[PDB]
Ligand binder design. Structure first.
Ligand code: 78V
Ligand code: 78V
Ligand code: SAO
Ligand code: SAO
Lengths: 341, 343, 343, 343
């Protein structure tokens, strides 16, 4: 199957084991912004659901399917690969919705549905939007979508912006500098100092921050889920040209994302921007090993290249340069091993 | 091989990916009690190392081998299965000990060593001592130990004691009761409340606590690494009969461990007890599904049975009863997936 | 052929005496009330050590100390000064109507000839970390003019060194050095020079003051007795130390200050530049380690601070320090001539 | 050599020791206006460099030569007399430019170049442009310049303008009046007040200021590096006739400078004017010993004479008079010892 071909078993086991825990479902569900925004998007666009066939990709507890049921859907296929599918069924029964919500245990790339659906719902977004590679399952599921069918969310915007945060930088450098010691309990560790810096700086920093650390208006990269195919997400090339609004050291790039539910009645946005209330996605920052100095008015240009890997994540390559001076930085990050700060 | 036969590959992948990080090695190395005590044990027992052949099981960065070198070891075979072996190789070279230290990449159950050693060193202890099941790798390596050889550490003591922590116990239900609401965004979640409670109680709690919550002097279970076999750790039955020092509700059992380096010159102890400075092992608490009331002077008896699984961990089965009243409580826990509670 | 010229690069000497030729610098020194007031106290409170005596003032500058000696009743004061400040001193001697008692002799104390032997030598020859500027050697050299039963003001000097913790200072220097870490400064890769840069920045003693609570152990004292010492004694100054750590943490380096004692017939007067005392224009001096050493309370931090005099009227400082319990060792080289004024 | 003949060894040693520090180089490199403007001037005039032979006089870290390399230069001879030459060589190697940049250690007046160059680049500007006397080295280097070769910078403009700053003026006496007290610790210092005032007014003041203190349009003195000789800078006479735009007291003359890179594609300016972003050169003010009153419309005429000395600096003689009243003022300043006032 498409899933297994692109996924190491070791990663898959851990991945679906992780989501088999009720506590994580709770963790996601208690994100009121997330859950509330999804419910708002579905219910205020009830006509996109009324008497329609729905596919819920990765239903987990089934919350989105219940939202779909509340909006008047005739029949909802709720596909779930982890052992959470069993608990979802329990909830379907206890809520007397057996006639409208149908749990399909298994991976969306592998199960069989009896019919084509009018709309696909899912919450497949990870850190930096693309982490976990579930967007590909979401897009893969379009094999079950009627020609003029719809998707909730409809589009996803990734925002990139340069930031300055010396304390974060030195915080990481401090950690790496442990390996700078010439005599740790009499042992010279210095020969590994380089490897340590690499390892620590390969970690995207997951957390939130004040918006004023941003040195330029963000650049936007849009994925249209109605149009995109799986393969489009195997290699994601995001070119950027920032017009610096402030002078200073650029320590790296900050990432967040929005998704839009473009329904018939209205468009509803779910945003993880640092200007918006905090969500469990927070924001993600990729550090440069060495910061770049730029004056206000300069242009910071380059490319963020995301390469999907078999561990359900991405190898991140960031190349950025101050055009006016030729000051250049290249960096490689492992989105699979982030730093929760 | 013995390792792969007792280990789910997925778990192994994850396991050796974990230790391939310099940050995790650093994490262990910066635990001053651990590292310093190992160094102390090795150097203060220099006659156990000077001109000796040494085997370092799971050398990681190679720190213990360097300690062995400082103590005067003639030849040190440093075995390491993760990609940390590469960095150890680098450090051996940069510290000009290539003539004394030989890094061997691979699992100790699978690599070939050329000769028998005088002493084996290792740090194979996990949560509750036994987690990660590396102790078995440590014992397995005794196929390379001379009949009159030594083990550093030489013995390992796991300590169990009954505790009272009303808030910890009630916490589980406070969290589980999230699901006990008839209209979470219009959804009745209550049918899953029981499952949520179960899930939380299956997790051993990793963190520390004030020693005053302990209601009896601990019971000790000793593994003598010089004498024990690998197989001895597949099923570990720890019977206990606690003499209660305080009256109250017993919510479960607290776990910690000590290891002793018994050298020719002296014995050095490394302790993770809650009476001692905190280590990266912290302490572990397993809850009873139902608390048991015990009076001071009463006896709390039962068994902690540790059953090794192929996920490099243990299923913990605890049965306990107050002998004076017959009040009985049990729990079953999955040590591979503990709850890190420490704040 | 003078000892001064033999031990001093001319380039350094020119600059050195030009520096002190400025009235603004004299003002700077004179306006340090602790210094000036304490000197006056030491001299006047021991007036009988001066009354009707012959005095030598080594490096009189503006001549203030000679005036103190005159106030104390000295019969004749030879005020030796090598810079052009000697002329300004003469002016003050005349305008203060003391031409009959204070005699300015322009030139280096190693080169001028005095008409007679003196009963007491006074001077203010202390530099940063006491020994900087190498004027103590001129002070000691001047003892060729001292009567057998003569005295020295100051009589002794105590250097105090103690380990400190100051993460922010360390990071402050490392941040500066990290400029040379850049792989593309305007398209230029500077990284190959980071090692040289870190060296250069950490080669600088930090001159300023600090909170006494950053000190992690009671100070160690090294005493120079000016009555007994020879010039040659200060070419190589070896200060061994063994600190008993009072606090756990990272030792980022050693902090230095000094006291001098005026041991007079009537009383002993102390001039202290310790961080517990009111600030002086000497402040305190800290030598950073390139890598801090972790030590817990109760540990011993031992080693040596070695000062080698150079021809630039300063010292090459080599500090070697080790945590005895762990063998964690740090070595450092500092250039006392080029310190970092942080205040 | 020409250099040693015009320079006291003392000054030269201090001078090249100063620039031997990576931190000082860093200080210059971190001046974004300076460095960035040089890079722009070179790169935006790429036709002046593409496949050309280049001489970098006093390359320091070698940054300008790397800029020349970025512009497509065939061969750059980078001459450097301090120990920074060692580090420059390192950077050429690590940047894989050994085939195009040749570091030549030594003074440009003493080294030999293998061939003639098409263009000379350098940053020889000091305070008020002429300080350090490096412009003479820059001009001296034209013995290696092909006829019709180019100079980057091509010209240097020194700007002089009368200013009013009552507080700056009064500050001098405020400081000098320290010596005007009849009993400083019992000593009458007053006889030296005059000398202290003199000393303070001999120091050019380095810092920046509000442009509204300027009382007339600046007068400009231009050095064309393509045409000028070394000897032209031994005696620099700058006559001035200022047409006062504001009424008030003139306390002295303010100095700044611009340099122009006149390339084939465009002319790029580097300015240190008080109307422009601040540089490490700041601006320089020379006070009159007595302020001059001028009405708006009056004419302030006179001369600024710069006489080069062997300390790699200038003796500044300024004479000015208000033509309408005959009110006259003079001052003599020592540019080698300026007062860094900037805060
Ligand atoms: C750590 O930050 C929190 N976080 C991060 C990412 C994320 N992603 C939502 C996606 N849900 C995943 C659910 O679908 C399930 N499945 C994930 N991939 C699936 C597939 N191919 N086929 C079927 N089901 C699939 C999975 O088991 C889960 O129940 N949600 C979060 O709240
Ligand atoms: C700069 O930081 C603060 N600080 C540090 C050290 C210091 N030392 C006093 C030294 N001045 C006393 C005078 O001796 C003079 N001379 C110094 N060496 C001399 C010699 N060999 N012969 C004659 N005079 C000599 C020197 O010119 C001075 O004017 N004073 C300070 O306030
Ligand atoms: N069977 C095995 N063979 C070889 N290495 C192993 C095995 N099991 C675990 N390890 C390694 O054992 C190490 C335990 S961590 C202790 C590392 C080091 N001796 C120190 O004291 O800091 C990890 O680096 C694992 O990769
Ligand atoms: N006569 C001379 N010959 C060679 N180098 C010199 C001479 N005089 C000064 N220098 C050097 O010239 C440099 C001036 S500083 C400018 C450094 C570098 N070009 C930059 O743009 O950052 C210093 O490094 C001095 O050591």
């Amino acid at each position: 199957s498409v899933f297994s071909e692109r996924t190491e078993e070791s990663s898959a086991v851990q991945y679906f084991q992780f989501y088999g825990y009720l506590s994580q479902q709770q963790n996601m569900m208690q994100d009121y912004v997330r859950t509330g925004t999804y419910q708002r998007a579905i219910l205020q666009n009830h006509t996109d659901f009324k008497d329609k066939i729905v596919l819920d990709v990765g239903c987990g507890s089934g919350i989105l399917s219940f939202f779909a049921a509340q909006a008047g859907a005739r029949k909802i296929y709720a596909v779930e690969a982890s052992t959470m599918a069993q608990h979802a069924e329990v909830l379907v029964k206890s809520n007397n919705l057996t006639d409208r919500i149908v749990v399909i245990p298994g991976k969306v790339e592998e199960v069989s549905l009896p019919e084509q659906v009018d709309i696909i719902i899912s919450e497949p977004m990870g850190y930096m939007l693309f982490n976990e590679r579930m967007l590909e399952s979401y897009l893969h599921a379009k094999k079950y979508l009627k020609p003029s069918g719809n998707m909730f969310p409809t589009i996803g915007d990734v925002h990139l912006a340069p930031f300055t945060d010396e304390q974060l930088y030195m915080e990481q450098f401090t950690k790496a500098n442990f390996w700078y010691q010439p005599s740790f309990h009499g042992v010279d560790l210095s020969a590994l100092r380089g490897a340590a810096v690499d390892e620590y700086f390969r970690q995207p920093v997951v957390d939130t921050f004040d918006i004023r650390i941003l040195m330029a208006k963000s650049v936007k990269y849009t994925v249209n889920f109605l149009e995109a195919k799986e393969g489009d997400l195997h290699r994601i090339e995001i070119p950027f040209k920032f017009h610096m609004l402030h002078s200073g050291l650029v320590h790296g790039l900050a990432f967040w994302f929005d998704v839009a539910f473009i329904g018939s009645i209205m468009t509803v946005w779910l945003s993880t921007a640092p200007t918006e209330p905090l969500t469990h996605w927070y924001q993600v920052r990729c550090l440069f090993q060495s910061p770049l100095f730029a004056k206000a008015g300069d242009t910071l240009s380059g490319t963020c290249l995301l390469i999907a890997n078999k561990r359900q994540s991405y190898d991140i390559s960031i190349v950025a340069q101050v055009d006016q001076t030729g000051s250049k930085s290249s960096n490689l990050l492992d989105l699979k091993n982030p730093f929760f700060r």
